[PDB]
Amino acid sequence: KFMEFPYVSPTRKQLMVDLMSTVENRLQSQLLPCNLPPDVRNFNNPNGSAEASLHIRSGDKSSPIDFVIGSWIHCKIPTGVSLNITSISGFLNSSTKAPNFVVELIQSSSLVLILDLPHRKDLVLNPDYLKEYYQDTALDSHRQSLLKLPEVNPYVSPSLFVRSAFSPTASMLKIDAEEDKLEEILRDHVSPAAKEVLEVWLERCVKEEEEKIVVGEEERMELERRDKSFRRKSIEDDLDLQFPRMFGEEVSSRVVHAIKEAFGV
Amino acid sequence: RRKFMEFPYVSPTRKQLMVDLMSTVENRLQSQLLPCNLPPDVRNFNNPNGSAEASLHIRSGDKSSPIDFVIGSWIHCKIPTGVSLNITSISGFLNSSTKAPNFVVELIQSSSKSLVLILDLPHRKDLVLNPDYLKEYYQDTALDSHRQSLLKLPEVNPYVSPSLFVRSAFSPTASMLKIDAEEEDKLEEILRDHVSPAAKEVLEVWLERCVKEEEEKIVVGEEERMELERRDKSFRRKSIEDDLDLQFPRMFGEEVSSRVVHAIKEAFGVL
Numbered sequence: 008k009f010m011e012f013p014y015v016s017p018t019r020k021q022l023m024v025d026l027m028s029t030v031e032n033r034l035q036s037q038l039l040p041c042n043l044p045p046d047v048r049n050f051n052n053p054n055g056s057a058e059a060s061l062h063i064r065s066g067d068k069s070s071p072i073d074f075v076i077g078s079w080i081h082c083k084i085p086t087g088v089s090l091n092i093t094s095i096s097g098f099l100n101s102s103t104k105a106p107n108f109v110v111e112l113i114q115s116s117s118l119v120l121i122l123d124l125p126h127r128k129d130l131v132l133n134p135d136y137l138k139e140y141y142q143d144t145a146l147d148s149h150r151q152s153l154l155k156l157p158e159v160n161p162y163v164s165p166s167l168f169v170r171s172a173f174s175p176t177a178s179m180l181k182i183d184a185e186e187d188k189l190e191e192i193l194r195d196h197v198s199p200a201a202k203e204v205l206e207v208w209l210e211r212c213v214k215e216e217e218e219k220i221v222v223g224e225e226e227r228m229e230l231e232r233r234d235k236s237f238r239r240k241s242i243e244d245d246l247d248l249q250f251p252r253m254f255g256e257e258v259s260s261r262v263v264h265a266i267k268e269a270f271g272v
Numbered sequence: 273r274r275k276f277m278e279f280p281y282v283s284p285t286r287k288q289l290m291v292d293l294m295s296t297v298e299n300r301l302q303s304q305l306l307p308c309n310l311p312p313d314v315r316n317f318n319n320p321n322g323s324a325e326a327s328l329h330i331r332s333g334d335k336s337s338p339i340d341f342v343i344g345s346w347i348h349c350k351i352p353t354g355v356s357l358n359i360t361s362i363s364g365f366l367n368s369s370t371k372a373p374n375f376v377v378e379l380i381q382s383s384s385k386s387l388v389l390i391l392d393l394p395h396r397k398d399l400v401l402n403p404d405y406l407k408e409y410y411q412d413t414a415l416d417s418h419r420q421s422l423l424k425l426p427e428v429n430p431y432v433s434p435s436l437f438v439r440s441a442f443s444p445t446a447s448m449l450k451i452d453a454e455e456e457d458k459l460e461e462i463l464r465d466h467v468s469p470a471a472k473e474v475l476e477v478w479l480e481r482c483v484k485e486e487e488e489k490i491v492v493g494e495e496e497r498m499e500l501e502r503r504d505k506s507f508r509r510k511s512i513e514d515d516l517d518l519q520f521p522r523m524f525g526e527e528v529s530s531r532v533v534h535a536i537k538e539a540f541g542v543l
């Protein structure tokens with residue numbers, strides 16, 4: 008269990024737990040046991056400059072879920088600075104068309120937040136999917152709400168892919184600053200927002216009893232290609248050239264092997 | 273009784289940018305632009321009461337040309353609020369004989385508070401599915417530089433549209449900007465010193481890297497061709513039934529709208 012969240016702050020560490028828990032609970036009926044070798048559920052750099060923990064529960068069949076993943080990456084920058092990442096991502100299989108789920112707190116020095124329900128179909132070709140999963144809900148409210156905060160501004164990634172892989176309502180934020188209020192921000196706004204978002208994913212994207220015969224060979228293969236494309240790109244950009252570094256060639260390869268396998272790539 | 277290239281109600285700087293822009297297009301694509309065949313009724317029109325006045329300019333592309341058609345326009349309208357709305361724009365649309373990006377530049381001044389600028393090379397293929405399309409037309413270029421460059425200016429800020437559709441229909445490098453204040457004096461400087469160069473450079477990459485002659489002998493495969501067709505349909509469809517279908521009957525009265533919306537839907541090839 009990576010539920011320890013060692014290096015993070017209590018407030019941050021607390022959000023990750025509530026979030027992860029809700030996930031595993033509201034979904035027990037459809038999630039399988041974590042079947043990762045202890046060698047992957049927890050790993051670090053030989054020299055001890057970086058430690059991490061992974062948690063991956065795959066979905067049962069008949070279930071709309073492909074798999075879920077939680078993790079925290081703690082590293083020590085040779086510049087004396089410490090990088091700490093904590094995330095939770097939900098991936099759906101092609102038996103469903105509904106958006107995925109992702110929340111991430113990223114802090115190298117301020118703090119970067121990523122909260123969103125990643126669309127799984129082209130929104131320009133499918134104007135109805137846009138209406139169904141984003142207009143109707145209130146995903147945009149959470150983004151705008153967080154914006155009002157003075158020490159909170161829009162975060163635009165250096166990667167164009169990242170920018171396009173996220174939905175129009177996705178919350179990509181850079182919260183500048185000074186513990187004190189930061190933790191207040193997390194507990195009073197971020198968490199409420201993050202939990203609300205996850206809420207919509209569960210009750211409207213995962214839970215369901217409508218999809219008879221729907222999603223035919225073509226539309227379905229469409230999804231598997233797009234999901235595959237996305238999953239591969241993101242692993243080649245975040246792992247392939249960032250892991251051999253943080254934990255040495257020995258580790259990465261085996262951890263990235265597991266992941267690429269978990270991701271079907 | 274104003275012509276398209278007259279741009280009556282806006283300012284000199286804005287008016288000049290729109291003229292330079294449309295002319296560069298017309299001059300640089302002489303070889304493949306067909307002349308405007310819009311009836312007088314559609315080139316220029318207004319609401320019988322005098323509240324709204326508009327001018328349209330559409331040049332369809334010849335066959336063998338990668339161009340669907342280019343359209344230029346300006347809408348002047350006086351809101352029951354006592355305030356006036358002015359929109360000027362130029363869009364370039366490519367047909368299925370190519371996969372290359374489209375082109376758009378729009379200036380929108382609803383209130384006397386802010387001028388909204390929309391400058392982008394709208395993508396025509398899904399970027400997550402086609403990462404190479406993303407690398408070819410966006411990374412490789414310097415399109416994002418225009419966006420962050422213009423953003424440094426204190427008076428300039430991000431403009432996030434009420435419409436989720438609009439938010440997705442644009443490329444990640446698009447410049448969706450909200451330019452501050454009515455400090456006429458400084459506004460005119462920005463458009464003159466920054467927006468103009470930015471737009472002409474953007475239009476420049478469209479002309480020489482999306483449209484550009486060279487070996488245009490590249491045939492869009494059978495299935496890629498159909499996707500483009502479908503996605504272009506969807507986009508145009510949405511775009512018109514959102515901007516025109518809900519706003520025109522209001523601005524110029526049912527009589528004119530149906531006439532101009534009909535001409536537009538025809539040039540966009542929709543049903």
Ligand SMILES: C=CC1=C(C)/C(=C/C2=NC(=C3\c4[nH]c(Cc5[nH]c(C=O)c(C)c5CC)c(C)c4C(=O)[C@@H]3C(=O)OC)/[C@@H](CCC(=O)O)[C@@H]2C)NC1=O
Nearest residue numbers: 078080092094096109113121164165166169241242245249
């Ligand atoms: C839907 C799921 C996901 C999305 C959308 C996602 C997005 C982003 N991750 C970044 C980063 C990142 N991620 C990880 C972990 C990780 N990545 C994957 C990918 O498949 C997996 C499975 C895992 C778990 C093992 C590390 C170690 C790490 C960085 O060092 C990097 C970062 O913070 O640098 C400052 C950001 C790129 C930077 C940018 O904005 O230009 C970008 C925001 N990461 C997702 O997991």
Ligand SMILES: C=CC1=C(C)/C(=C/C2=NC(=C3\c4[nH]c(Cc5[nH]c(C=O)c(C)c5CC)c(C)c4C(=O)[C@@H]3C(=O)OC)/[C@@H](CCC(=O)O)[C@@H]2C)NC1=O
Nearest residue numbers: 345347359361363376380382390433434435438511512515
């Ligand atoms: C590739 C081409 C185009 C793109 C991509 C495009 C995008 C946008 N137009 C908006 C608007 C808009 N457009 C027009 C004219 C017009 N629309 C079409 C559509 O097919 C045609 C053919 C024409 C005739 C030339 C009017 C009158 C009008 C508004 O009142 C509205 C606006 O700004 O209100 C403040 C924005 C809505 C969301 C927002 O507020 O951010 C959004 C940014 N408009 C294009 O023309």
Ligand code: NA
Nearest residue numbers: 154155156157
């Ligand atoms: Na703010």
Ligand code: NA
Nearest residue numbers: 423424425428
């Ligand atoms: Na600025």
